[PDB]
Ligand binder design. Sequence first.
Ligand SMILES: *[C@@H]1O[C@H](CO)[C@@H](O[C@@H]2O[C@H](CO)[C@@H](O)[C@H](O)[C@H]2NC(C)=O)[C@H](O)[C@H]1NC(C)=O
Ligand SMILES: *[C@@H]1O[C@H](CO)[C@@H](O)[C@H](O)[C@H]1NC(C)=O
Ligand SMILES: *[C@@H]1O[C@H](CO)[C@@H](O)[C@H](O)[C@H]1NC(C)=O
Ligand SMILES: *[C@@H]1O[C@H](CO)[C@@H](O)[C@H](O)[C@H]1NC(C)=O
Ligand SMILES: *[C@@H]1O[C@H](CO)[C@@H](O)[C@H](O)[C@H]1NC(C)=O
Ligand SMILES: *[C@@H]1O[C@H](CO)[C@@H](O)[C@H](O)[C@H]1NC(C)=O
Ligand SMILES: *[C@@H]1O[C@H](CO)[C@@H](O)[C@H](O)[C@H]1NC(C)=O
Ligand SMILES: *[C@@H]1O[C@H](CO)[C@@H](O)[C@H](O)[C@H]1NC(C)=O
Ligand SMILES: *[C@@H]1O[C@H](CO)[C@@H](O)[C@H](O)[C@H]1NC(C)=O
Lengths: 492, 492, 489
Amino acid sequence: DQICIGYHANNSTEQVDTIMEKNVTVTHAQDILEKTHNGKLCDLNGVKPLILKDCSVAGWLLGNPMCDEFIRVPEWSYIVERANPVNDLCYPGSLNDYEELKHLLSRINHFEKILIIPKSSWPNHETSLGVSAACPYQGAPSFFRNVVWLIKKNDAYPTIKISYNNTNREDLLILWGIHHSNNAEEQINLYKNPTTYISVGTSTLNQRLVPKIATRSQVNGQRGRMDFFWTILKPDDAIHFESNGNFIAPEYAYKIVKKGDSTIMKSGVEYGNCNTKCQTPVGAINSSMPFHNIHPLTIGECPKYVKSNKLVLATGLRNSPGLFGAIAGFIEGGWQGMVDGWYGYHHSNEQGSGYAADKESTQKAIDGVTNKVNSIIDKMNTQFEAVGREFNNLERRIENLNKKMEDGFLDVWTYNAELLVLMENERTLDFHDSNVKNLYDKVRLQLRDNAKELGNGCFEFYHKCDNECMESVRNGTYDYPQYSEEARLKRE
Amino acid sequence: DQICIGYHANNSTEQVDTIMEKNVTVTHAQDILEKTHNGKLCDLNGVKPLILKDCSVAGWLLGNPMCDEFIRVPEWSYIVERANPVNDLCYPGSLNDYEELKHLLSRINHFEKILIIPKSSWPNHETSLGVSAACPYQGAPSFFRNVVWLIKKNDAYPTIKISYNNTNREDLLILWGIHHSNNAEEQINLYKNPTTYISVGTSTLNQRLVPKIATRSQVNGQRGRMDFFWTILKPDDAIHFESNGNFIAPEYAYKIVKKGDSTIMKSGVEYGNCNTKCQTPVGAINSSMPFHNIHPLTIGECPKYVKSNKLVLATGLRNSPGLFGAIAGFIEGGWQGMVDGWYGYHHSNEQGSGYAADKESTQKAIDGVTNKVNSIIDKMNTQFEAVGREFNNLERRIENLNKKMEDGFLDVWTYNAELLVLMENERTLDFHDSNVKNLYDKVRLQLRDNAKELGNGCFEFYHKCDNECMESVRNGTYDYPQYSEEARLKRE
Amino acid sequence: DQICIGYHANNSTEQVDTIMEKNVTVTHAQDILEKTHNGKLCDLNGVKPLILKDCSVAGWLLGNPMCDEFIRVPEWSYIVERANPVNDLCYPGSLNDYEELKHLLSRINHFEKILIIPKSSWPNHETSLGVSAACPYQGAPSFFRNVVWLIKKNDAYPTIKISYNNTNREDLLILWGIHHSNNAEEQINLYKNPTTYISVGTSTLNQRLVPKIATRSQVNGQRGRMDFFWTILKPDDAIHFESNGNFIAPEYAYKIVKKGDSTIMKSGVEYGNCNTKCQTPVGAINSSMPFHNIHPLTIGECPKYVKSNKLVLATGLRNSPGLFGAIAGFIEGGWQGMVDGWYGYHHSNEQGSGYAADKESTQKAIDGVTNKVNSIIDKMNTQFEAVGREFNNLERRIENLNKKMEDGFLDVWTYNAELLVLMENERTLDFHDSNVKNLYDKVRLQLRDNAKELGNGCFEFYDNECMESVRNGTYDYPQYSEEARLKRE
Ligand SMILES: *[C@@H]1O[C@H](CO)[C@@H](O[C@@H]2O[C@H](CO)[C@@H](O)[C@H](O)[C@H]2NC(C)=O)[C@H](O)[C@H]1NC(C)=O
Ligand SMILES: *[C@@H]1O[C@H](CO)[C@@H](O)[C@H](O)[C@H]1NC(C)=O
Ligand SMILES: *[C@@H]1O[C@H](CO)[C@@H](O)[C@H](O)[C@H]1NC(C)=O
Ligand SMILES: *[C@@H]1O[C@H](CO)[C@@H](O)[C@H](O)[C@H]1NC(C)=O
Ligand SMILES: *[C@@H]1O[C@H](CO)[C@@H](O)[C@H](O)[C@H]1NC(C)=O
Ligand SMILES: *[C@@H]1O[C@H](CO)[C@@H](O)[C@H](O)[C@H]1NC(C)=O
Ligand SMILES: *[C@@H]1O[C@H](CO)[C@@H](O)[C@H](O)[C@H]1NC(C)=O
Ligand SMILES: *[C@@H]1O[C@H](CO)[C@@H](O)[C@H](O)[C@H]1NC(C)=O
Ligand SMILES: *[C@@H]1O[C@H](CO)[C@@H](O)[C@H](O)[C@H]1NC(C)=O
């Protein structure tokens, strides 16, 4: 007639790691690293992204003739751009502050293209000969669709003086440019006047552009360049243009109608006719898990990115095939027969045997391990969220600074995650070692010298303990005096 | 007849948090988070700040006629500037490298405005007509007080050639400007010479300014603009000016007399006629706590900023209404009667009863807990300290980079603060748990079978233990031989 | 007639720190901080550094005469620049995007200087009169040697139109310059043409340069300025020059042969004809230690920089001059006569008295301790590595951002390293305490009433073979129980 203290054991093969030991099999565990993605680009909460295909942001905004799919773009969630889009700036040149404009586009979800300066507004200039083979459309030379390349009419280029007032309540993105000719003859053939200028002015802008007539290398079949510029015209402000040649005048402008969360994603992955709440350049994430290792740059409701390969929290006890010396100590193994709890008793009397779990000790441990898991997840709610930022060829130091800043915070938070899991896993296992010892000691305090301590977690009753007597030991109501006289005689 | 082992209990309602349990009431606790401020701006160690009111740094340095309170500024501890100062640049334009100049002002505590080029030095130019209604002073057109707007004299603007040599043995801040006229008629009306230039040359500076005569929008009633520029003239270096129009000559220069710790604070709160050692834009801090959650940007000897709402370190033990089985284990509760220490004894004999504390074990716990608290404070002595950095409209990428860097370190150090407190509170509670068990076991080894283990932390003496016998147990000097026979006789 | 439970003690003076206690003397400990360097500049994995001596990068690239001739410079592991090079630009001026060029050079391991434009290509201009006293060689006026200062010939400076095509298939670094004259007379005496320009054009460059003739302060005895510019000519691309005066024309250019990890180190300590895998400006480091405190800026496979002055991990026991009550508890002191392991027994019996160690208990402690130390060595490899980034006087906001960022990451990883050692040192000392206690209880349950629990860690039994058997885990309680009742009273 004996009663024993024991703990749970199942067929689990899951393994966690600690600072002192690796690959420790446990009865229950919780993974906290999501590792899978659908490998496709999807809608973000029902909103389809804007995929520019092989068109760049500059080609879409300036109106590259090969980017005509994007003339009435619907509202977008994020913008997908291939790393090297081919339909960018058909006529060679540049877009000034292109990276700063992309930063502004990252906070915009929708444009509304509006005609600001019609071609009927240039009666004494030619509007149809600003066309080049570098910008082909359907076999014929064309040009950017949103701006107009003005050239001389009747061998004369009168000084232009035009102003547009943003009578709209929304901010206006306006683009214009200057044409760099190649020689003194081409300058005359296109704009009679030899020495030319462009003056652009607003409340804030005070810009004067002068063409650089020099010999340059051939790009896209053209030795000339076209430098473009942009500005944000505030409501009830006006832009004032003055030029006597080489003026690439605005025709359409973009009304910033929707501002919100967006990003310019560099990706060649395909749209998969799907929806998601979390999107990465490599694919979309579908998980309730607190961490992921897919990609640092994410958008939407996303888990926090880490560089880990495995991250599993220990929630149960060390499974059987010790700071407190109970689990894998004087109790050498767990019981597969005890299924209703983590800790409990095995009784053996003449009426039979059976397993019984101590619900109070088990529920206290369940509440503790649940609070620890919940505490660790909430402690990582505020992590570093990497953002995409673009820099040019002469901004390498700043680009390198942005790389080390985002990578440095990643290694810091990756280390914080793996070390907190490593440390708290050791604590969780030793927390189970306590509750078993405290359960063994609680039974030991109740039985006293009425039973014998075998040393394996079992108590050999000196008296006779039936099923009701067995339950009273588990109850906490074992009556020592009721059986003291029989135990006294049983000794020798 | 009986001696017991127990622990302290009091009326404290202070609560600490652990990883496995929150809102744990403890006997003693130390708050380490300051959450209060006086809500006013004060002097820093007896030095009053420079409060520019509605004037900007540009308006103060250039000499906006509406900023005449600051023509002689005393040495300041920090600079206070409202978010959107009204006065600023009375005549529309810009101050080149404005944010870079504000970065140099943050390392400067005092200027000495000195007159470097008098209006006497301009014999063949008009020095008293360069005024505008955009810069009114007591109902009459005026201009920036530190520069002179030179215009033509006798319908002639001879080419200016002037040089100033820094003989003041300290660095000198010099400001000058260029005026952008609106048309060829206004250009001639003010300067006669139609094509103008400004050449500024030092040992490192080689600048050429040319007016941009164009059509702009009206700002402060003026369609013209005025672009200002600055340099730091090192001692024994000379600045060379040359211009034939549109030149805004320096009159007064700022002499850097004292350099030290300062900051350009952005706040709308008012001066409170107070002194402090720590100042934030929302208020001043008078505290000895190691942490605060007032504002990230502080100046002076300050606590370390965290984003925590509560940060309480557990110093005592779980208060009564663990890993080791003592506190809230076989010892059910604490003793409100023990007030001399954390752990001790309760004796009950024929002479009477009494509460006594174990000085040795209590002092050992006090020293460890005190060293712990001091260790947690010391490891946070080197934290990230945010600094104010300004950026213009075309530095959004870097400004966003700066915000993410400073916010990322705040989240990292906040995480370290709450997690270290969360983990060490758990350890502190088990530390008290073990010390009670180690004290109960120490008496257990002394008495052996001379007393009966009650199981609740009390020992029922088989023999008679008087007041000095009870003291021998607390001393650790209990003579088991002297009473072996009586205890054996009392056992039947 | 007794066997006892005890732990190791020795003569160790090594100290560790915990959060609750400082200067704790331990039996065994492992230092994990490197604090020594050779104080020399050495080769990195067999490759000698490029030491520019008293010369700047710009002086070497442009061809300062007082600088070394720097011909056929071999492949370098890293570049060494004095903090304030005394040569730099002999003729006063500037080099556009100098810091961005040095960033590019930090990612380049070999240059090959090639002659791109011969002086034979200037028939109508003077190619030998562009010298100044500000650029002296042999006490005679000279100039930068990778660039030519073209001067008028026969009171004439005809407009120049020249092009060079990059046929090499490696990227090319080309430098040109402009002279800012002092007075209109000087302009004519040197170039005749009064209004001058320089036009430079490539596939990506569209530059126009007009001289600024003005009065300046004199530097190196010259009031004129020589402003230099650079570009990277991609393969099968051409650079096109056009100027009617004030043109400092390219003569030699630098071909990018190898692009790899390198750095511009700001050091003045001497080359020591040594080899290392880790170099700092103060000296080189040879160490397997996971941390170092020599200098933040390092090149090669290096330990991780921390601002700590001491970092010692506790691998052994609290030495005799806890959460569990064994060490410094009911066992008051350790055994110096016990040299075989951390835990074990001392026996007193018929055959003699003997100290023996429990190898199974010690090995479990050794295995866990080494696993902890190795787990602390790792999880530290992915730290922050500081890079040298340069900024000019009007980029001070960004320089402060860079400095605060690099110092912030150092302070974070310093806090992480010290707090990890403090916390795990304490857990180690308690791990030993539990190990001893569990050993004491393993024999306690075994012997039962066949021995008396003395309370000092010793058991008073009521032979060598039996003594070893209890240490094995075997004991026949029936075989030895009877004498005990008689031995009692
Ligand atoms: C663009 O048009 C608006 C609206 O006409 C001008 O803003 C003011 O609007 C009021 C309407 O009552 C007019 O009476 C004012 O004459 C206009 N402007 C003021 C005081 O600024 C606006 O100025 C025009 N914008 C520009 C740059 O010319
Ligand atoms: C473990 O047992 C469950 C049934 O209780 C079974 O569904 C599962 O397949 C088993 N898992 C393994 C790894 O054997
Ligand atoms: C732990 O398990 C993984 C496979 O699950 C194995 O690759 C690794 O070698 C194991 N490490 C140890 C220390 O057992
Ligand atoms: C055990 O506990 C239940 C209530 O939880 C009680 O009804 C029952 O009488 C107890 N039985 C014994 C043998 O103590
Ligand atoms: C708790 O006891 C202390 C001791 O006097 C006293 O200062 C305090 O007011 C008491 N608090 C309450 C709620 O009784
Ligand atoms: C802890 O105490 C605070 C203050 O009374 C209370 O707001 C909060 O609900 C409590 N939290 C828990 C888990 O009981
Ligand atoms: C300024 O004055 C000192 C002495 O009068 C002189 O040595 C120095 O050259 C002057 N500085 C310049 C740039 O001329
Ligand atoms: C620890 O020991 C060293 C060497 O004896 C000594 O320099 C140092 O002051 C000690 N630290 C403390 C806190 O006593
Ligand atoms: C350089 O030479 C190659 C070979 O003829 C030619 O293809 C290339 O176009 C040339 N580069 C330029 C810019 O002309």
